[PDB]
Amino acid sequence: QELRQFIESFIQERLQGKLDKLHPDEDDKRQTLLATHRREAWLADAARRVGQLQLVTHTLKPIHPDARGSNLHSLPQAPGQPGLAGSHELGDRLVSDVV
DNA sequence: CAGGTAGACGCGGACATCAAGCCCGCCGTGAAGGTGCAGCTGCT
């Protein structure tokens, strides 16, 4: 209704980027791409794809690139002791990651 | 078996200008990606 055209242009830019990247002109591969992108089967696939976690304070993959474990999105409390401090808890509001 | 005592060692003034400082061509490639799904053989 209001912002439907924005996400429609988003899927269309994705489709035209895929067509310019592949550039296959055999057996209607562009038609098989337009069969998925121009309809809302892309929205069903985007609803299907699960695995994102939105975790910032914990990311295990820097320790090893294949280390399946638990990732967390939780900031600690502020400590009581003076001097040392970490995890930027005062200001300059954070940006989150996706694992 | 032996071999010396003593006291002092100078001043002055000056130390140069000129002009320039090269061109050319080129700098290696190879290996260092997870994850999820479909489908194929082998087995009970």
Cβ A68 vs Cβ A99: under 8 Å: no
Task: Write the DSSP string, A9-62.
Answer: HHHHHHHHHHHHHH---STTHHHHHHHHHSSSHHHHHHHH-------SS---TT
Experimentally, the structure was elucidated by cryo-EM
Q: Closest nt to A49 (CA→C1')?
A: B36
Distance, Å, A32 CA → B24 C1': 59
Q: Closest nt to A68 (CA→C1')?
A: B34
Spatial separation of the C-alpha atoms in residues A12 and A8, rounded to whole Å: 6
Resolution rounded to one decimal, in angstroms: 3.2
- Protein residues closer than 7 Å by CB to strand B: A 51, 65-66, 68
Distance, Å, A58 CA → B37 C1': 28
Spatial separation of the C-alpha atoms in residues A50 and A21, rounded to whole Å: 26
Distance, Å, A70 CA → B15 C1': 86
